[PDB]
Amino acid sequence: MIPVTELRYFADTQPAYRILKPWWDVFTDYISIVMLMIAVFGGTLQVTQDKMICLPCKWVTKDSCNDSTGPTGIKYDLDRHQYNYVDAVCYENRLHWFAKYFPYLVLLHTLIFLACSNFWFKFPRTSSKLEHFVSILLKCFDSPWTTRALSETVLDKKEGEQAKALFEKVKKFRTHVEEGDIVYRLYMRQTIIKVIKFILIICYTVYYVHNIKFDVDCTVDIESLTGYRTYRCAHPLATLFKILASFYISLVIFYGLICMYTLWWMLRRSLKKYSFESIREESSYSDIPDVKNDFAFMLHLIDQYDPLYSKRFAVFLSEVSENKLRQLNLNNEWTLDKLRQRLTKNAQDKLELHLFMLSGIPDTVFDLVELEVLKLELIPDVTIPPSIAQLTGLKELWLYHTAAKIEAPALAFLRENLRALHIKFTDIKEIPLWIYSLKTLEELHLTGNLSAENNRYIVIDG
Amino acid sequence: MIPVTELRYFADTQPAYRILKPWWDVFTDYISIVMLMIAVFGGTLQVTQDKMICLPCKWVTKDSCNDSTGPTGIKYDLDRHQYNYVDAVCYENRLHWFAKYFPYLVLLHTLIFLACSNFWFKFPRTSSKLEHFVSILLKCFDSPWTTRALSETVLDKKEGEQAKALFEKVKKFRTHVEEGDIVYRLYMRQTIIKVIKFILIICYTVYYVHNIKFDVDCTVDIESLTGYRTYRCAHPLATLFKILASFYISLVIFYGLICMYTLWWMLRRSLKKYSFESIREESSYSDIPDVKNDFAFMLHLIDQYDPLYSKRFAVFLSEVSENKLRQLNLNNEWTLDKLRQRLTKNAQDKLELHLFMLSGIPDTVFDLVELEVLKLELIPDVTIPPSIAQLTGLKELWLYHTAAKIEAPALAFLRENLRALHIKFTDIKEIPLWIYSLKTLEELHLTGNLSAENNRYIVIDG
């Protein structure tokens, strides 16, 4: 007999955690609220009317009532207070404890269920991890960069800066969490406790629910006080208590079935590992590693909520997207005046630029229309963009340990507008295959072994 | 007997979803609150007074009361507690279950109705979709471009990029949801469940409501306890319960009528597919496709709220709108006149403009009446507009990897006012087929391989 809204304290989380609640958690929260309602109703029902009316049996045979002008009433010669005394005594002694304390057992079981549901949200060690993960997930879902990505079928420096900051935050969080294995373990334990709690409530309640009967029969051995051997009592609340007990059993059965579904869902597919196979297969972004424990599980929960969050979060775990972002913001801070002052006119009166150890080629490079020599040193995974057609005066290109991809327009421009090529390489992988389709080259300079085992000079057959 | 604020846990949803509640959902929510109110009232009424005053009948005929100095009272020789006992016994055994458990049945039915109404708001797999859809819908309704468009009959950078971002968010959301089918199916299932629940409730309640009588007659066979065979009872709460049951019947009838209207509205017109036919007539946007399942459904739902939402949202579904947005942002960021400073008189003493790698042709181009040479480089999906007829002095057009389409007026202008054409192409798709219908051409320049395997010079047969 304590209002639901004050018992609700046990069952309430942040609205932020709404993402972390799969459908089974939501269903069990609803069912727990209903269980709490019937616990409160039964408790008030008992407290305000716990009556038990008892009448003595004048003819008693074998500790049992013999059950045998106009009719006249039977006279027992008992005070109202003697009737009250025998009611209290037979309600205390010869009434089954289940019919007495059922609405309190219901409340206690419901509170244990609520505590099991919300423990991992209240426990600080996992509450911190969940709130950190949900904040990161919401920021990734909010970031404009995740909109630009996945859309491949010039950007602002400030947003392009906070996007790299989000990459760093994701990396730090992943490093900090991916070794924990505490959220998964705690969730395992909570579900197991819920299942073995349901599997006990069902047995004991079904076993004892037959003891809630309306017509109780008591023999309390108080002959000195009232003068009657045995009494025939009547527990008026018994029918409504059976109804509430049966309704509670139905609710507990549903709760246990849902918890068994959750337990089975966790016993299969090994939630400690996360695949990301679908995204890397439908976006060609294969560079998304399998996520280890305590981070695979938290992603599996969001998949139960919305696969969209996982998809929009995978973009912040791929190295390809990181490279794209670093190229994109390399262009943001690179103006053209900072590029102009950095340029050098060399000994042959040719304007040159020398770059080394960057993540790629800034696109702002190719607006420096006076440039005549381009040098690229130790830059990985380069692709030549079409804007190279703007460098009408280019004569030399130096590729030092830099493999380069290219498509046809830029290729044609280079076929028609190049005089020299320098290459410094370790092996064949740093030799672009397209060089032999060129036609205006006047100098070629190769630094490295041109031969392989049993394949002498295959590199230069063309 | 739980106050209706605790029950209001089941009966509420976040106001973000007023857009998704048609008038029938609003009416059923109101009716459900009223039914909950009468359930609570009946529950407290029963708990505080579930009395059944019973008096014995001294003259009994055919298991019924014969009902046949100054007047004096009838002496029954029963203690107060024997009266209590027979009240309890006749209330348990000889009072109809409907008259006892009517308010609890009302509470159970109302809870089931509320659950069936809010399930699709609580179910994460559809709750996520509805939240996503409504957020996109509100952003589209409030976005400045939605009123910049539809009015056709120096722009903020932030606004200009968020409009583009909103276009892509609409595209991604449409792709993610349009193959769903789940929201509509689950809504239909909820409505069907409500309709069968109404059909069952009205049946059983009408069939049994006649059993709530005031004067009950009980024969419970307790002579060993009271000495009286049959009793004439009286359920003081019977008339109030009858009027409460009739009020509940009225509410259930209204609820069922509304739910059958919803079922009918869902059954006809094939809500799995939208039209946009009305919108695309008053907008001159024939490029707005029919919308498939799970997206047509929420469009239909919003139309039940305000058709303006769907109208202001349909702009982000037409390719023409995206093209116009890109043209407008392009012309804004590359100002009308900055172009004049950008022009160049070339080596052949012809005034030229060189453009590259844009999304289309800025309309500001065709105010540059001094032009003689136009260069277009790597621009997709170009259609030449009629305003090219303004450029009376045009003598050269260079299309470098820029496919172009055209209609007859601009085409005739170019037929009559062109001397040379240069084309740089990857394959035939970048060759405009109309060139052979030209008449005033003096130079043709093709850059690219004109031949394919076993198909020499088919490209140039014309």
Ligand SMILES: CCCCCCCCCCCCCCCCCC(=O)OC[C@H](COP(=O)(O)OC[C@H](N)C(=O)O)OC(=O)CCCCCCCCCCCCCCCCC
């Ligand atoms: C609404 C929130 C309810 C809050 C309850 C408040 C107090 C109620 C009674 C107290 C019981 C609560 C559980 C206490 C268990 C110890 C918690 C604690 O702080 O220890 C820290 C532990 C230690 O980490 P570990 O060594 O890596 O894991 C092995 C672990 N010893 C094991 O169980 O192997 O780190 C852990 O890993 C935690 C151990 C696992 C505990 C799992 C319990 C799940 C549900 C428990 C809720 C209580 C249910 C009944 C209470 C309801 C009462 C009406």
Ligand SMILES: CCCCCCCCCCCCCCCCCC(=O)OC[C@H](COP(=O)(O)OC[C@H](N)C(=O)O)OC(=O)CCCCCCCCCCCCCCCCC
């Ligand atoms: C306030 C919200 C109340 C929340 C309920 C809390 C728990 C109360 C009792 C639980 C009953 C819930 C209804 C069943 C939902 C089960 C969800 C579940 O287990 O799997 C999720 C299912 C997956 O199925 P599917 O892939 O779409 O195809 C099969 C499909 N079901 C079919 O019929 O082929 O996805 C689905 O498709 C869902 C099935 C659609 C059925 C629509 C049910 C609407 C009314 C249900 C409300 C409960 C009413 C009674 C509760 C009141 C108790 C007082």
Ligand SMILES: CC(C)CCC[C@@H](C)[C@H]1CC[C@H]2[C@@H]3CC=C4C[C@@H](O)CC[C@]4(C)[C@H]3CC[C@]12C
């Ligand atoms: C959820 C599905 C399975 C419906 C659940 C209904 C079952 C589990 C509940 C509802 C009513 C309950 C019964 C109500 C009363 C009695 C009579 C008693 O002498 C033995 C237990 C017994 C028989 C209960 C057993 C469990 C019961 C049958």
Ligand SMILES: CC(C)CCC[C@@H](C)[C@H]1CC[C@H]2[C@@H]3CC=C4C[C@@H](O)CC[C@]4(C)[C@H]3CC[C@]12C
């Ligand atoms: C679906 C969920 C929410 C409710 C399930 C309905 C069940 C649990 C409810 C509704 C009808 C109820 C039963 C109707 C008939 C009786 C007769 C009564 O003398 C003993 C209890 C018993 C057996 C009730 C027990 C509880 C009961 C079975």
Ligand SMILES: CC(C)CCC[C@@H](C)[C@H]1CC[C@H]2[C@@H]3CC=C4C[C@@H](O)CC[C@]4(C)[C@H]3CC[C@]12C
């Ligand atoms: C606003 C609407 C929905 C209220 C519903 C009005 C009707 C359904 C309610 C209001 C007044 C009620 C009636 C008042 C008169 C009587 C006579 C009484 O001896 C039996 C109940 C009965 C027959 C009631 C039945 C239900 C009743 C007719």
Ligand SMILES: CC(C)CCC[C@@H](C)[C@H]1CC[C@H]2[C@@H]3CC=C4C[C@@H](O)CC[C@]4(C)[C@H]3CC[C@]12C
């Ligand atoms: C909103 C509209 C549908 C109101 C409809 C009113 C009708 C359908 C409802 C309202 C009150 C109801 C009546 C209330 C009182 C009685 C008297 C009882 O001995 C038999 C049932 C009976 C006859 C009910 C039958 C249905 C009833 C007449």
